[PDB]
Write a protein that binds this ligand. Structure first.
Ligand SMILES: CCCCCCCCCCCCCCCCC(=O)O[C@@H](COC(=O)CCCCCCCCCCCCCCC)COP(=O)(O)O[C@H]1[C@H](O)[C@@H](O)[C@H](O)[C@@H](O)[C@@H]1O
Ligand SMILES: CCCCCCCCCCCCCCCCC(=O)O[C@@H](COC(=O)CCCCCCCCCCCCCCC)COP(=O)(O)O[C@H]1[C@H](O)[C@@H](O)[C@H](O)[C@@H](O)[C@@H]1O
Ligand SMILES: CCCCCCCCCCCCCCCCCC(=O)OC[C@H](COP(=O)(O)OCCN)OC(=O)CCCCCCCCCCCCCCCCC
Ligand SMILES: CCCCCCCCCCCCCCCCCC(=O)OC[C@H](COP(=O)(O)OCCN)OC(=O)CCCCCCCCCCCCCCCCC
Ligand SMILES: CCCCCCCCCCCCCCCCCC(=O)OC[C@H](COP(=O)(O)OCCN)OC(=O)CCCCCCCCCCCCCCCCC
Ligand SMILES: CCCCCCCCCCCCCCCCCC(=O)OC[C@H](COP(=O)(O)OCCN)OC(=O)CCCCCCCCCCCCCCCCC
Ligand SMILES: CCCC[C@@H](C)[C@@H](OC(=O)C[C@@H](CC(=O)O)C(=O)O)[C@H](C[C@@H](C)C[C@@H](O)CCCC[C@H](O)C[C@@H](O)[C@H](C)N)OC(=O)C[C@H](CC(=O)O)C(=O)O
Ligand SMILES: CCCC[C@H](C)[C@H](OC(=O)C[C@H](CC(=O)O)C(=O)O)[C@@H](C[C@@H](C)C[C@@H](O)CCCC[C@H](O)C[C@@H](O)[C@H](C)N)OC(=O)C[C@@H](CC(=O)O)C(=O)O
Ligand SMILES: [N+]
Ligand SMILES: [N+]
Lengths: 132, 302, 309, 131
């Protein structure tokens, strides 16, 4: 009977821990759930990248999604990166509406390798380029 | 004497913990025993308390406390009182013990629940306060203490059920489901907020169970007040577990989306959205259906 | 229909294999877009060069070639190996049953053994050279024949472990240690392939294959009651010592010293480089368990030699 | 035959767990290699960067900086105002084994709304983002 009690308590603790970790991951990684990255390739490796989502896809979620995509879809070890993130200061951090007519993204980034780094430098339009 | 006094060891553990906590002059969040003895997470000096891992330690410590209370009440007053009423049947005495313990616990909890509601915007079971303040990250001292104590008591009851100290019981089937759904409901309506939303259900179940246990105890004594007690009990049952629960379900249907904000936002831990409305609706509709089944039992008995 | 399947247990695997292969060849695609290529052959290839990567479809290749090896073993044992034993006029049922497995192992280790020697010869690991397995770490992309060898051997060992799991025959004396040996085969192959330690496991594949080939030859000749068994057993013990002990101790010593001083040693999860100060104890333990098992079997062989001398 | 199913399920679970371990380590290598450093200046503004071995390249430093900025600070409570400064003098991979290391490749100053005036002067001509 003691083993059954221990098993039930362990199952309850596992459920509590799983739900707590689910909450923690959703809060920390909400940019994955709410923001869907959008890529608009412009060259062999240069892509104009941003994120789209609902009101919960705030500027923080957009920045997190952009940085995640830049650091995951590109390997600086194989070839050194060159990107820049451009703010859209004309919109609030909660600009995105619930409906499909999202509008201009709050954060937009151009990322590409160093062979075509000239195109990235010319597309940033005086924005600081963060080599990686 | 611990073999025939089951509350000696829990009392010793409780008194040791309390003495160790009180003797030290820290008596605040810095003290290690503050995780178990009292509610830990508090934002500044405001009368609002957060959530965290230390709440689970509070739940376990007051699980031990409620084990002590359950054993001690029966051993000191409930059993002598049952003997005093000239009751001799083993089944009668044993069932009266649990019914009177339920009477005491519910007459302490339900009044506490209505007192806690009276000091909030949830009075008269108003459904607007359910979702206007969602998410409810922080809850008042009494609101959190009541919730955590109810969780600890129900977890203690579930642990007793699993321990099968007295396995043969004819009520085990529905009682086990009730305990499981109660633990699930409290835990979900605490970790996933909706803490303000679980209090009215808390109050309805506590008051209905209080009147049910009172009517049951009067029936066991075969007194002349059993019929009147059962009548007021069934009136309160149809008022609380059916009228108020159906009002809450209607709130989940039409007022859940309107009040507060309905867009999902994991960043702000605001889960009141379109994928949580079905979960909250089914998780209370199951309880409402079980209450309807118990109402069928009541009508068959009445 | 079912009567043949009851005894000829290779009929259903033959049916599955022939239907899969016939569909793959009749489709006419024979490319990675063909989803039968995910099972029939190795899928991931790096452009047109003979460099092949890793992925999920490598597990399905193992899954399909598990059935392939089940079919091959059962088919060979019933129609080829068993009549060959009958032609040898073996009068003992248990001895014939043991010879069945011994000749199957002879075939597998005389096919994969020279296979290992051939793939090693086309690499820089000739004569179990200590430097090459750490020069190019991580070996993310595997050569064509190299990956075929790894994948087929993994499928064969998984098939043998599965057959051992379905215990049908009586547990033999070394079942306590042979189950550990099968577990360590699967663990070592899956860890070396997944964790890019693929070059280094070839030098342990080859010693295994050659020593097992000569071991099975020794058992086959003894069960056959041949007169040429002492010479073959002497060759077996010499090559067993040289491969499973001298070469294995050289590999372990390289893990002790040449693991660090040769090749890139800094840990880098970004580049999937695990050759560091953490993987060194794991590799040394995973190979020292093997060395302990091989030393116990060396003790058994030494006991046999002492008894027969 | 249930033993076969159990063995196959356990083996597949181990393979999937190791594959997920490799995938997470490759994706989240900045957690293992880069140790964040928070050097507060005044108020809520902190000079934030990361240090580690050669595996903590500029990508790892940038990822750690972004994670700390978006984790330790809540824009919902108050809108942020930060910047990230690149050290052009160092290569993308510059951190040595030695504990002395050197000047970090990426340095970030992150502060809340009331501290935006401090972070604006701390970032100097570097572009200041809002969060
Ligand atoms: C009593 C116990 C009660 C327990 C309660 C447990 C609740 C579990 C709920 C999780 C279910 C999945 C939530 C998906 C949220 C989402 O992620 O919801 C996604 C679904 O898509 C997608 O990727 C979901 C991914 C697939 C499933 C994810 C699951 C990942 C693992 C989590 C499960 C862990 C469970 C652990 C159990 C212990 C939609 O996001 P949203 O921003 O609302 O919608 C936007 C809009 O804002 C806007 O209109 C946009 O234009 C666009 O339309 C967008 O759609
Ligand atoms: C399957 C199991 C998967 C487990 C995954 C666990 C992930 C989280 C674990 C957290 C543990 C503490 C983190 C320590 C951080 C750190 O401390 O990271 C360590 C250990 O990593 C490491 O998590 C532990 C290794 C990973 C797990 C071990 C192996 C697990 C087994 C995998 C399966 C194998 C199968 C084999 C089959 C038989 C290495 O960082 P490093 O950059 O080298 O060190 C730098 C130096 O570069 C620098 O010089 C110094 O400034 C300083 O020293 C820095 O720290
Ligand atoms: C043996 C004695 C000692 C025991 C020590 C503990 C052992 C087990 C450890 C379990 C670990 C997992 C649970 C805790 C994970 C960490 C949680 C944490 O750090 O806090 C997150 C959260 C509070 O933070 P939140 O408000 O979400 O975010 C604020 C935004 N800045 O935190 C929470 O919300 C945590 C809430 C936990 C308790 C809530 C449930 C109370 C009622 C329980 C009823 C009984 C159990 C029911 C189980 C289900 C039904 C069977
Ligand atoms: C049958 C019972 C069913 C009860 C249903 C409702 C569940 C309630 C939970 C069980 C009892 C909880 C005991 C009191 C709450 C403990 C948590 C706590 O924080 O207690 C307060 C005290 C320290 O308070 P502190 O946080 O410093 O300041 C608060 C105001 N700023 O912390 C302490 O150290 C206090 C220690 C002494 C507490 C004395 C009891 C106070 C009254 C509680 C309600 C009644 C419960 C018991 C009823 C028994 C009836 C015979
Ligand atoms: C007891 C051991 C013997 C058991 C194995 C015997 C195998 C005999 C042949 C069985 C039938 C399969 C024949 C090939 C069918 C698939 C055809 C196909 O899609 O192409 C061949 C394929 C990939 O090769 P290829 O096309 O060259 O790839 C580059 C693309 N232009 O080719 C492949 O991917 C072939 C995969 C073969 C995997 C073999 C698994 C076991 C490996 C160890 C033993 C094999 C040793 C054989 C002798 C080697 C001598 C050097
Ligand atoms: C006795 C029991 C017998 C059991 C049979 C098996 C026995 C062991 C045989 C050894 C097999 C070794 C190979 C196993 C799969 C290895 C996959 C692998 O290495 O993937 C690596 C890949 C990354 O690719 P890489 O080139 O390293 O890096 C690219 C970017 N630079 O990583 C990836 O991210 C690729 C995706 C990997 C996903 C793996 C999922 C594993 C679990 C799948 C469950 C479902 C399987 C369905 C098919 C089988 C069941 C029908
Ligand atoms: C001759 C008298 C027999 C009366 C009994 C048939 C009856 O009792 C009455 O209803 C009172 C009476 C008054 C009057 O005079 O009017 C009347 O109405 O008949 C009682 C059944 C009803 C009470 C129906 C309830 O079960 C359903 C409600 C369940 C809800 C959950 O439980 C909630 C909580 O539990 C949970 C833990 N939060 O039957 C018994 O179960 C008692 C017998 C007694 C015995 O015979 O010794 C026993 O089993 O022990
Ligand atoms: C059931 C075992 C029979 C084996 C042979 C018939 C014969 O084994 C015996 O002979 C039986 C012997 C009885 C005795 O004679 O005393 C005994 O078992 O004790 C053999 C002795 C060795 C093979 C020792 C083995 O057992 C242990 C091997 C461990 C290796 C691991 O498995 C590796 C695998 O796990 C993994 C998959 N890689 O080779 C001979 O000895 C032949 C003689 C003939 C002669 O004398 O005329 C010779 O040529 O020299
Ligand atoms: N998504
Ligand atoms: N770390």
């Amino acid at each position: 009977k003691i083993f059954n009690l221990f098993r039930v308590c362990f199952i309850s603790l596992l459920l509590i821990a799983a739900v707590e970790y689910f909450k923690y991951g959703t809060r920390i990684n909400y940019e994955w759930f709410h923001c869907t990255p959008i890529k608009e390739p412009q060259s062999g490796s240069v892509i104009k990248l941003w994120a789209r989502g609902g009101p919960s896809c705030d500027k923080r979620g957009e920045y997190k999604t952009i940085v995640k995509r830049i650091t995951r879809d590109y390997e600086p070890n194989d070839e050194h990166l060159s990107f820049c993130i451009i703010e859209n200061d004309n919109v609030p951090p909660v600009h995105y509406p619930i409906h499909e007519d999202k509008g201009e993204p709050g954060y937009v980034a151009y990322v590409g390798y160093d062979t075509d780094s000239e195109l990235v430098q010319e597309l940033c339009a005086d924005s600081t380029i963060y080599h990686m | 004497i611990s073999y025939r006094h089951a509350w000696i060891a829990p009392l010793m553990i409780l008194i040791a913990v309390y003495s160790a906590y009180f003797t030290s002059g820290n008596t605040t969040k810095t003290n290690v025993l503050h995780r178990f003895v009292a509610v830990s997470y508090q934002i500044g000096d405001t009368n609002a308390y957060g959530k965290g891992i230390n709440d689970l330690c509070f739940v376990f410590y007051y699980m031990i406390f409620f084990t002590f209370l359950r054993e001690f009440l029966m051993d000191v007053v409930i059993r002598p009182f049952a003997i005093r009423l000239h009751v001799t049947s083993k089944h009668r005495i044993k069932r009266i013990m649990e019914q009177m313990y339920a009477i005491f616990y519910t007459g302490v909890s339900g009044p506490f629940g209505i007192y806690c509601m009276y000091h909030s915007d949830l009075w008269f079971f108003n459904t607007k306060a359910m979702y206007r303040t969602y998410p409810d990250f922080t809850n008042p001292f009494l609101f959190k203490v009541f919730y955590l104590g109810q969780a600890a008591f129900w977890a203690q009851q579930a642990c007793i059920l699993v321990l099968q100290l007295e396995k043969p019981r004819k009520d085990h089937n529905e009682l086990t489901f009730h305990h499981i759904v109660t633990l699930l409901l409290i835990w979900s309506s605490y970790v996933f907020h909706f803490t303000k939303m679980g209090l009215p259900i808390y109050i309805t179940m506590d008051v209905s169970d209080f009147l049910l246990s009172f009517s049951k105890t009067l029936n066991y004594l075969d007194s002349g007040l059993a019929f009147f007690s059962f009548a007021i009990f069934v009136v309160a049952w149809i008022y609380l577990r059916h009228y108020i629960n159906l009002k809450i379900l209607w709130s989940v249907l039409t007022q859940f989306r309107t009040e507060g904000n309905y867009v999902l936002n994991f960043a702000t831990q605001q889960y009141k959205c379109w994928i949580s409305l079905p979960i909250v609706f089914v998780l209370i509709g199951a309880l409402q259906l079980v209450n309807l089944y118990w109402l069928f039992l009541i009508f068959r008995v009445l | 229909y079912r009567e043949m399947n009851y005894r000829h247990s290779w009929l259903t695997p033959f049916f599955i294999l022939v239907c899969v292969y016939s569909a793959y060849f009749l489709s006419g695609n024979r490319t990675e877009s063909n989803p039968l290529h995910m099972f029939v052959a190795i899928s991931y290839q790096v452009d047109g060069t003979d460099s092949y990567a890793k992925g999920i479809k490598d597990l399905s290749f193992v899954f399909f070639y598990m059935i392939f090896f089940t079919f091959l073993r059962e088919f060979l044992m019933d129609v080829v190996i068993r009549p060959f034993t009958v032609y040898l006029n073996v009068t003992s049922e248990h001895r014939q049953k043991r010879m069945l497995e011994q000749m199957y192992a002879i075939f597998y280790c005389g096919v994969s053994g020279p296979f290992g020697l051939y793939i090693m010869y086309h690499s820089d690991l000739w004569l179990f050279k200590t430097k090459p397995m750490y020069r190019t770490y991580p070996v993310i992309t595997n050569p064509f024949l190299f990956k075929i060898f790894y994948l087929g051997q993994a499928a064969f060992w998984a098939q043998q472990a599965c057959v051992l799991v379905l215990q049908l025959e009586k547990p033999r004396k070394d079942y306590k240690e042979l189950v550990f040996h099968h577990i360590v085969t699967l663990l070592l192959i899956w860890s070396s392939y997944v964790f890019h330690f693929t070059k280094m496991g070839l030098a342990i594949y080859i010693t295994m294959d050659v020593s097992d080939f000569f071991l099975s030859l020794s058992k086959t000749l003894n069960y056959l009651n041949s007169v040429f068994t002492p010479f073959v057993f002497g060759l077996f013990v010499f090559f067993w010592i040289y491969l499973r002990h001298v070469v294995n101790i050289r590999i372990l010593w390289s893990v002790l010293t040449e693991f660090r001083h040769e090749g890139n040693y800094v840990l880098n999860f970004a580049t999937q480089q695990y050759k560091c100060w953490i993987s060194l104890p794991i590799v040394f333990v995973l190979i020292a368990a093997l060395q302990l098992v091989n030393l116990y079997w060396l003790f058994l062989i030494l006991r046999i030699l002492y008894r027969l001398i």
